[PDB]
């Protein structure tokens, strides 16, 4: 009885973490060999953040407006350029503590840590998940804007940098070649997050664990097509399941005799009537966060 | 408002593995000592009735294999405190952090840097449970994973070394004292039934209002007498004065006094949640302290 939820331990990301202040403006950064990646927003003031003209703004900063401190010592700015959404500092020094690293961008359902730094601090880490509205939920203050997010494999991925908070209280940002992951824009302006859904694929990969670790109590008799699962489990506010999905699933159903139409007409039950004060692993409620690479390689 | 662990970044570089003949567990490398379970000197076949006093007169230096990364340490002596064994190697470590061994009450919370082997592999942030026991996640391999606390000074608190057949860990401090009524043999062992952490729930209810979440507040209050009798109705660790006392930063930001607030929670116990959700949750969380929700929000 019991799956917690872990991250991946921060300590090769720590070393990389660095402040960058830029007038009044003060966020973190990421030092990976000879560059520093920070948002770009760093140049603006809050005057400027309605309608930011990102290019006017930064042919006006010479190298020495960007301060930049890896705890006590001071880098030096020898040239910056801008890709995208994220500003590149580029200094006399590259960062000794530089792990083996990768940039990959995620789509929505993958999970990843994220290390959650003030002033370039780390103060806490944790496991999250980016939700299919794109957005992350998190615990982000003023101040931790430039934290990343990364999953280890030696190799660290990099994967996610934290750009804005959003006004129902979810965070947005960018992959570390500045993209924005979803519609959002770094500007202040009304921008709405669409409606947040549960992430079936992962449901089913942790209910698939359920079976392995001895929970059965769920299962039923009936099978469904994909087409009738996905009508109803739209009316649950359930990402619909694709024939990927299905075939992602297949070595648990494997390991397990249960297919995946299988699994989906329980969860399909579970959906209709509740939890019965019962629990699924030790949790009285469905699990998204668990995706079925992370549930495969654990058991 | 999420479950945040410490960075593990100061503790990272003191683990190492420990191989006492066939068994292969965890260590914790400081100056120049390796601290881990003394259950490494043991066979499968010796967890009936082990006499550890005896079995360590048995061993030599050279039947411990210590390994640090590739780096290979050498025993030079070693020593028993309780049910933790000092092993003496020929190298300090010099990524040693400034630390501490400090020991927790129940209800307290830290971090776990889950090990397999001498390598990080996971961590999470978890409460010491009132039975004495941490829902963690170890398998076989983590015996000798660590936690922790962070104030520059790592305080470590924990050291894993038995897992109980419910799912729930038990371990001891640094200094080899268990935390509960546990022995380190294998036998059946049974923890004790696991109540609420009371001053827990009412920190959470605090953030849940500093996130301006106020919908359980109610004009009521109740004493501290008449909530303990429903408290420990429904498995609710009693409420002290000093809980209290330890609320009151957190009651002068929100200006709900913690009667008051105890009023709301009374409420929510008999009356159930009436299908709604606080902070996101229709579960109400005790794995946050007071101090962890001064530290997360203000």
């Given at each position: 009885?019991?799956?917690?939820?872990?991250?991946?331990?921060?300590?090769?990301?720590?070393?990389?973490?660095?402040?960058?202040?830029?007038?009044?403006?003060?966020?973190?950064?990421?030092?990976?060999?000879?560059?520093?990646?920070?948002?770009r927003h760093v140049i603006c003031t809050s005057e400027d953040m309605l309608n930011p003209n990102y290019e006017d703004l930064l042919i006006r900063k010479s190298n020495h407006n960007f301060l930049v401190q890896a705890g006590n010592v001071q880098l030096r700015v020898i040239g910056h350029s801008m890709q995208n959404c994220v500003l590149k500092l580029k200094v006399d020094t590259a960062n000794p503590k530089?792990?083996?690293?990768?940039?990959?961008?995620?789509?929505?359902?993958?999970?990843?840590?994220?290390?959650?730094?003030?002033?370039?601090?780390?103060?806490?880490?944790?496991?999250?998940?980016?939700?299919?509205?794109?957005?992350?939920?998190?615990?982000?203050?003023?101040?931790?804007?430039?934290?990343?997010?990364?999953?280890?494999?030696?190799?660290?991925?990099?994967?996610?940098?934290?750009?804005?908070?959003?006004?129902?209280?979810?965070?947005?940002?960018?992959?570390?070649?500045?993209?924005?992951?979803?519609?959002?824009?770094?500007?202040?302006?009304?921008?709405?997050?669409?409606?947040?859904?549960?992430?079936?694929?992962?449901?089913?990969?942790?209910?698939?664990?359920?079976?392995?670790?001895?929970?059965?109590?769920?299962?039923?008799?009936?099978?469904?097509?994909?087409?009738?699962?996905?009508?109803?489990?739209?009316?649950?506010?359930?990402?619909?399941?694709?024939?990927?999905?299905?075939?992602?699933?297949?070595?648990?159903?494997?390991?397990?005799?249960?297919?995946?139409?299988?699994?989906?007409?329980?969860?399909?039950?579970?959906?209709?009537?509740?939890?019965?004060?019962?629990?699924?692993?030790?949790?009285?409620?469905?699990?998204?966060?668990?995706?079925?690479?992370?549930?495969?390689?654990?058991?």
């Amino acid at each position: 009885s019991g799956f917690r939820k872990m991250a991946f331990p921060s300590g090769k990301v720590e070393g990389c973490m660095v402040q960058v202040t830029c007038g009044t403006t003060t966020l973190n950064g990421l030092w990976l060999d000879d560059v520093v990646y920070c948002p770009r927003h760093v140049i603006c003031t809050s005057e400027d953040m309605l309608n930011p003209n990102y290019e006017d703004l930064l042919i006006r900063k010479s190298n020495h407006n960007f301060l930049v401190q890896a705890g006590n010592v001071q880098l030096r700015v020898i040239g910056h350029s801008m890709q995208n959404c994220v500003l590149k500092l580029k200094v006399d020094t590259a960062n000794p503590k530089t792990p083996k690293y990768k940039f990959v961008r995620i789509q929505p359902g993958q999970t990843f840590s994220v290390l959650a730094c003030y002033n370039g601090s780390p103060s806490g880490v944790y496991q999250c998940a980016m939700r299919p509205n794109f957005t992350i939920k998190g615990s982000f203050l003023n101040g931790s804007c430039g934290s990343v997010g990364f999953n280890i494999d030696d190799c660290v991925s990099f994967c996610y940098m934290h750009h804005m908070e959003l006004p129902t209280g979810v965070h947005a940002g960018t992959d570390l070649e500045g993209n924005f992951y979803g519609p959002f824009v770094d500007r202040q302006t009304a921008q709405a997050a669409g409606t947040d859904t549960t992430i079936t694929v992962n449901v089913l990969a942790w209910l698939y664990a359920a079976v392995i670790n001895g929970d059965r109590w769920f299962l039923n008799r009936f099978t469904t097509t994909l087409n009738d699962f996905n009508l109803v489990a739209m009316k649950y506010n359930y990402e619909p399941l694709t024939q990927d999905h299905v075939d992602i699933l297949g070595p648990l159903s494997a390991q397990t005799g249960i297919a995946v139409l299988d699994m989906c007409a329980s969860l399909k039950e579970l959906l209709q009537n509740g939890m019965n004060g019962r629990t699924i692993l030790g949790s009285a409620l469905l699990e998204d966060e668990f995706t079925p690479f992370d549930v495969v390689r654990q058991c």
